[PDB]
Amino acid sequence: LRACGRFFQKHQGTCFYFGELPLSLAACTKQWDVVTYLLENPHQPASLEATDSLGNTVLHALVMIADNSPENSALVIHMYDGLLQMGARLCPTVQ
Amino acid sequence: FDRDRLFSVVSRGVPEELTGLLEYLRWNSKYLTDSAYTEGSTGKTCLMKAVLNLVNACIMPLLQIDKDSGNPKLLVNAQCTDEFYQGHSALHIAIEKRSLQCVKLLVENGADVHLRACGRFFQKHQGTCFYFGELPLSLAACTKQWDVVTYLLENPHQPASLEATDSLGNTVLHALVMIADNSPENSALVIHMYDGLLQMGARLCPTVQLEEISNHQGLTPLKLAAKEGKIEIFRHILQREFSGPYQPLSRKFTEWCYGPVRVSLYDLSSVDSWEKNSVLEIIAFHCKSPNRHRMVVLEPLNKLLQEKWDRLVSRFFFNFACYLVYMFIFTVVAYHQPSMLLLGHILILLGGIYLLLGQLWYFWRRRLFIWISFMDSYFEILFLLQALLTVLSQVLRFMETEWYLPLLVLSLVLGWLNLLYYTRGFQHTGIYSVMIQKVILRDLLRFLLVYLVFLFGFAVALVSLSRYRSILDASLELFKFTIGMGELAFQEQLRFRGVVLLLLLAYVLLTYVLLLNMLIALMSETVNHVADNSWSIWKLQKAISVLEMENGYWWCRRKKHREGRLLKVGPDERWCFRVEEVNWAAWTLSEDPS
Amino acid sequence: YRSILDASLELFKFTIGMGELAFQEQLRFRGVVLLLLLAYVLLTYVLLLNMLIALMSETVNHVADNSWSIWKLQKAI
Amino acid sequence: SVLEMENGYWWCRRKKHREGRLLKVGPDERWCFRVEEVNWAAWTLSEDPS
Ligand SMILES: C=C(C)[C@@H]1CCC(C)=C[C@H]1c1c(O)cc(CCCCC)cc1O
Ligand SMILES: C=C(C)[C@@H]1CCC(C)=C[C@H]1c1c(O)cc(CCCCC)cc1O
Ligand code: NA
């Protein structure tokens, strides 16, 4: 399900652009346990290649939320490699 | 004997020597509290001496023997009569000595916990003094004795009153503000006591709002902190949050949280400029502390001022445009001073009266601001000076004095100086204008006095020795060396040709010493300059500008809307200002974000 | 002193150190024009030196790597 | 500057008073200079402050 509201869009005012998918929300909020369960759910697994309203994937959302802060940079970097590592096991063919 | 006998005994603390002559108090018909036994130098009594020497095992027997005699005035409530040390009691000594046990004995024996020490030592003096307030309750809080104050407030007999005021109307919270000195140790001491008293205030006096109590000068503890310059305690009070039991005691709340995005609700009970005599008005004008600019950059104050500034940018630039149009007429009228010219002079006369009335009203509203901080209101006098001269110049023209032309052009050049006042509205040159007077003018004034001493000192010697012809001309020629147009040469017709050149050569060398050292003198100011200090001054300058123009023009006192939104916290309604922040290291009033 | 172009041109010559200030004897207001001219000369020293100080802080509070990185970007473009 | 001018002018060698107050420490009398300071991190010859 996609949250295409004005609050979830990249606004200059009040907003929070975590992407558009529940999978992106878990990655942007630093919940490794949720995303692992969502991807490896035996029923209705989340798709890594699912795109947002702007075409952004899970990896794209990690780039947008980056703010070069020392805490944020560790959050984005740690999630980026983890999703890539999990991507090989889940979708080896998809780059 | 008697006075000398008792003081020596109580100093050692032996109660055995105290036994005997106790019945002599009734036999001699003399009271212990009377002037015979207390020292006439300062009114100090034996009980005060006993409390001073420590717990003195003689405290209880001394109070025991007093009640045996018939004393109309209780000894434990005796007050020192010395003017310098007036109002001090044995209870104050026990609190000062950090003796919790001693305080208990006096309190359990009927000590008054509301005695006021109104001596010169306890007043806010520039010399020797210690202003802890005026009450025993305030002394414990200011001396960082949490055990004493808890016992005093929760004493089963004669509990201390939190709302008791000092001689200046200061309460316990007010005394904490005054003793603050922004020191890292002092700030922790004041902050820790301030929240503790507030937390204990809810349990003891739930109905009484201690924060809203004002002293004899009508200042709440939050307002008093802003005026006195105590930024450290002021920052803590401005944004304050607590747990569930003390949630209403807080001032900063969270409306909703969604991931890293958070919104904060700072209270504006006495901070918003809508209410008369607010924190913003006190900080900008009434406050005179050197660290005045460090307050307007606080977390809730910076956002509130920026929000107010944006809503009045057009009005600020409208005034600048109107003033610019005023000088478009003024410059042309001055250029063609000797049909529409009569219309031009009419508009100039009205313009001069217009600014004169507005500036007079500005000075009528506030006068201490100019005296307290001349640097902040430097342009206030200049606008008044230009307006007064322009109005006066038009009067002389109508009076047929023929004396107006020098004055009319003076307002032209002086007014164009006032155009630089509006440069504070631009972030680029507004910060740049800070060093125009704050950094440069604070030291370059001294050089001018030095230069004229050298200029006139050499000018008299040059003209006298050469008799180059007049004092005005000799000084004028010496001044031309500064602009690089000086004419030095070996005169052949001079009576002393070599000597006048030597003095002239000496003068030229001194200016290079003077000018380069002046360049070096102000060099250190730029090198040893804090970047945030210059930025903070500009923020204060905008804060003063918006506050003055928020009241509207002099003829039209336009009503001001109240910033913030009224909403219920939990049923109490408090106006709050939304501040939205994003925190990624974090790993609610309402549920749905808005 | 006679035309707006000439008066501004003479005032500009003070910046290059070629300004001609003197006590005129034929002027109707001899002392007043000198006072305004003297005031103008003082302001340029305030203006120019403060401008030297204003850009002084940029050099003092300057990062060495920042200037070098700009040149690398310039070559990259 | 103050030391040179404390001796007075050349013609009039004015007498100089002794700074400080004579008082007993404990019986030894030593001139002392009062310095008053406020310390909030601390948490006596005479009893009564003056
Ligand atoms: C070094 C400086 C700052 C200037 C720079 C220009 C030149 C040629 C002269 C130098 C100079 C001296 O080197 C020494 C003095 C002191 C002598 C004055 C009284 C005899 C003045 C003096 O302008
Ligand atoms: C110290 C500076 C920066 C310059 C250096 C050269 C000399 C002789 C003048 C000094 C000076 C003042 O010391 C003060 C002012 C302000 C007065 C202007 C309006 C009356 C200007 C002004 O150039
Ligand atoms: Na030059």
Side-chain angles (χ1 to χ4, degrees), chain A residues 1-5 7-9 11 13-39 42-51 53-66 68 70 72-85 87-93 95, chain B residues 3 5 7-11 13-15 19-20 25 28 31-33 36-40 43-59 61-63 65-67 69-72 74-81 84-100 102-107 109-119 121-123 125 127-153 156-165 167-180 182 184 186-199 201-207 209-231 233-242 244-246 248-272 274 277-280 282-287 290-293 295-298 300-310 312-314 316-327 329-332 334-336 338 341-345 347-367 369 373-375 379 381-387 389-390 392 394 396-397 403-422 424-427 429-431 433-435 439 444 447-461 463-465 467-468 470-472 474-476 478-491 493 495-524 529 531 533 535-547 549-550 552-556 560-562 564 566-567 569-572 574-587 589-591 593, chain C residues 1 3-5 7-9 11-24 26 28-57 62 64 66 68-77, chain D residues 1-3 5-6 8-12 16-18 20 22-23 25-28 30-43 45-47 49:
Chain A
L1 301 177
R2 284 171 175 78
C4 51
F7 178 70
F8 316 104
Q9 291 167 20
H11 272 167
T14 187
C15 76
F16 171 50
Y17 183 78
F18 60 89
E20 287 273 323
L21 277 301
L23 182 44
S24 306
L25 180 56
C28 293
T29 42
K30 200 191 64 186
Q31 326 186 29
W32 191 241
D33 289 345
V34 164
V35 55
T36 44
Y37 164 64
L38 271 170
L39 283 180
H43 42 276
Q44 202 144 0
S47 183
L48 287 166
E49 57 192 4
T51 61
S53 296
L54 291 172
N56 286 339
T57 45
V58 191
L59 305 183
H60 287 99
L62 266 296
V63 159
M64 311 285 288
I65 64 170
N68 299 336
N72 198 0
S73 303
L75 196 145
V76 176
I77 282 168
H78 178 246
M79 280 297 137
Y80 197 83
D81 55 59
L83 273 296
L84 264 177
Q85 286 163 0
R89 319 192 291 104
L90 271 298
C91 52
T93 60
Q95 273 269 12
Chain B
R3 191 177 109 180
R5 182 181 64 191
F7 274 114
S8 60
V9 162
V10 301
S11 63
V14 288
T19 299
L25 276 297
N28 296 0
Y31 293 149
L32 190 151
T33 303
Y37 282 68
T38 192
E39 303 172 352
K44 186 170 122 190
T45 79
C46 77
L47 177 55
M48 311 182 167
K49 182 90 162 178
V51 173
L52 273 158
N53 294 114
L54 301 182
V55 176
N56 182 2
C58 191
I59 310 291
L62 167 48
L63 300 166
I65 62 170
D66 192 33
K67 57 152 165 49
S69 61
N71 211 1
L74 295 174
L75 159 71
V76 65
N77 296 334
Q79 300 279 53
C80 290
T81 299
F84 160 80
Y85 191 75
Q86 167 60 244
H88 203 123
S89 75
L91 178 55
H92 297 78
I93 314 178
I95 299 162
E96 151 69 27
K97 290 300 177 184
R98 320 289 304 278
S99 185
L100 177 56
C102 183
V103 168
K104 211 166 304 308
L105 271 71
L106 277 71
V107 164
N109 281 127
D112 189 87
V113 298
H114 282 98
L115 301 177
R116 284 171 175 78
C118 51
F121 178 70
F122 316 104
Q123 291 167 20
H125 272 167
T128 187
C129 76
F130 171 50
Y131 183 78
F132 60 89
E134 287 273 323
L135 278 300
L137 182 44
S138 306
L139 180 56
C142 293
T143 42
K144 200 191 64 186
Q145 326 186 29
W146 191 241
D147 289 345
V148 164
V149 55
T150 44
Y151 164 64
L152 271 170
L153 283 180
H157 42 276
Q158 202 144 0
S161 183
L162 287 166
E163 57 192 4
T165 61
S167 296
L168 291 171
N170 286 339
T171 45
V172 191
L173 305 183
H174 287 99
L176 266 296
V177 158
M178 311 285 288
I179 64 170
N182 299 336
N186 198 0
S187 303
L189 196 145
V190 176
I191 282 168
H192 178 246
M193 280 297 137
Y194 197 83
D195 55 59
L197 273 296
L198 264 177
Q199 286 163 1
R203 319 192 291 104
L204 271 298
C205 52
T207 60
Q209 273 269 12
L210 318 176
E211 190 74 18
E212 322 301 329
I213 300 172
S214 64
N215 46 0
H216 274 126
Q217 65 183 177
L219 293 184
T220 74
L222 173 62
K223 288 176 188 182
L224 183 62
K227 181 168 170 305
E228 287 297 325
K230 329 289 193 174
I231 174 171
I233 184 63
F234 174 69
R235 182 220 319 278
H236 183 76
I237 302 171
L238 211 52
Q239 49 264 21
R240 194 178 57 220
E241 71 275 60
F242 287 132
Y246 299 114
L249 207 65
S250 302
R251 276 176 77 94
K252 168 185 167 187
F253 314 95
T254 305
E255 189 186 356
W256 51 263
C257 180
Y258 194 98
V261 177
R262 299 182 40 82
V263 60
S264 313
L265 263 63
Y266 301 88
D267 201 345
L268 301 181
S269 61
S270 65
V271 190
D272 209 26
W274 182 91
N277 199 10
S278 54
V279 162
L280 288 167
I282 279 173
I283 284 184
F285 313 97
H286 292 289
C287 181
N291 50 358
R292 187 178 66 188
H293 49 99
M295 308 216 187
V296 297
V297 298
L298 285 193
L301 279 179
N302 196 5
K303 306 262 168 285
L304 179 53
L305 285 168
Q306 183 85 46
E307 193 270 332
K308 280 159 154 306
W309 166 251
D310 275 337
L312 280 185
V313 166
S314 75
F316 175 74
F317 273 10
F318 178 65
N319 288 32
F320 160 73
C322 277
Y323 185 80
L324 202 57
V325 162
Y326 169 83
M327 301 286 248
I329 300 166
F330 203 100
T331 307
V332 175
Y335 191 73
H336 305 289
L341 187 64
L342 170 65
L343 188 153
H345 280 285
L347 265 70
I348 301 299
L349 174 71
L350 303 182
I353 296 285
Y354 173 75
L355 279 72
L356 182 62
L357 288 189
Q359 215 72 19
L360 272 191
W361 184 64
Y362 164 75
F363 280 114
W364 173 244
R365 279 188 285 121
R366 65 192 74 256
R367 50 209 80 86
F369 172 59
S373 297
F374 175 72
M375 271 307 285
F379 274 110
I381 294 93
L382 282 183
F383 269 85
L384 179 64
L385 191 43
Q386 187 266 331
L389 287 177
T390 296
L392 189 151
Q394 287 310 106
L396 292 177
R397 187 183 69 87
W403 178 255
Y404 86 107
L405 183 63
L407 292 176
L408 195 142
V409 298
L410 274 171
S411 53
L412 181 60
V413 286
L414 188 153
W416 278 113
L417 275 66
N418 307 346
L419 198 76
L420 294 176
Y421 154 75
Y422 291 104
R424 63 192 48 187
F426 287 99
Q427 72 279 344
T429 185
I431 311 168
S433 168
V434 177
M435 291 136 298
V439 176
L444 64 90
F447 187 52
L448 201 43
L449 284 179
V450 169
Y451 200 73
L452 311 193
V453 176
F454 278 130
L455 165 74
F456 289 112
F458 271 81
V460 176
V463 65
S464 65
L465 183 64
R467 182 182 65 198
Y468 75 105
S470 179
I471 182 55
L472 184 47
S475 60
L476 197 49
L478 287 178
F479 189 74
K480 289 200 218 189
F481 288 100
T482 314
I483 69 166
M485 271 303 260
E487 295 259 16
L488 58 92
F490 184 57
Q491 300 291 328
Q493 50 97 23
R495 170 66 184 86
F496 296 114
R497 52 190 72 86
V499 191
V500 61
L501 184 61
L502 193 142
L503 278 72
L504 183 57
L505 276 169
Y507 171 75
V508 176
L509 293 199
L510 291 192
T511 81
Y512 263 100
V513 172
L514 277 182
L515 278 176
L516 195 142
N517 186 340
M518 176 178 73
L519 177 63
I520 297 302
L522 310 172
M523 182 36 48
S524 60
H529 173 81
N533 273 7
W535 194 78
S536 69
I537 296 294
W538 174 58
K539 304 305 279 191
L540 174 62
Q541 272 183 349
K542 293 213 308 300
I544 292 178
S545 305
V546 62
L547 280 169
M549 78 187 297
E550 190 177 356
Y553 298 110
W554 57 276
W555 72 92
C556 176
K560 42 185 89 161
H561 69 281
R562 193 208 308 260
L566 190 141
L567 59 86
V569 174
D572 59 326
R574 293 152 75 165
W575 296 78
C576 302
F577 180 76
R578 288 173 74 262
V579 166
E580 166 180 346
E581 63 192 343
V582 184
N583 192 8
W584 295 97
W587 314 318
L589 258 65
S590 295
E591 299 174 353
Chain C
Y1 75 105
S3 179
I4 182 55
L5 184 47
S8 60
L9 197 49
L11 287 178
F12 189 74
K13 289 200 218 189
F14 288 100
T15 314
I16 69 166
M18 271 303 260
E20 295 259 16
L21 58 92
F23 184 57
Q24 300 291 328
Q26 50 97 23
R28 170 66 184 86
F29 296 114
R30 52 190 72 86
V32 191
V33 61
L34 184 61
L35 193 142
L36 278 72
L37 183 57
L38 276 169
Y40 171 75
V41 176
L42 294 199
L43 291 192
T44 81
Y45 263 100
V46 172
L47 277 182
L48 278 176
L49 195 142
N50 186 340
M51 176 178 73
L52 177 63
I53 297 302
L55 310 172
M56 182 36 49
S57 60
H62 173 81
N66 273 7
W68 194 78
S69 69
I70 296 294
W71 174 58
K72 304 305 279 191
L73 174 62
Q74 272 183 349
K75 293 213 308 300
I77 292 177
Chain D
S1 305
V2 62
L3 280 168
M5 78 187 297
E6 190 177 356
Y9 298 110
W10 57 276
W11 72 92
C12 176
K16 42 185 89 161
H17 69 281
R18 193 208 308 260
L22 190 141
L23 59 87
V25 174
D28 59 326
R30 293 152 75 165
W31 296 78
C32 302
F33 180 76
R34 288 173 74 261
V35 166
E36 166 180 346
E37 63 192 343
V38 184
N39 192 8
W40 295 97
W43 314 318
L45 258 65
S46 295
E47 299 174 353

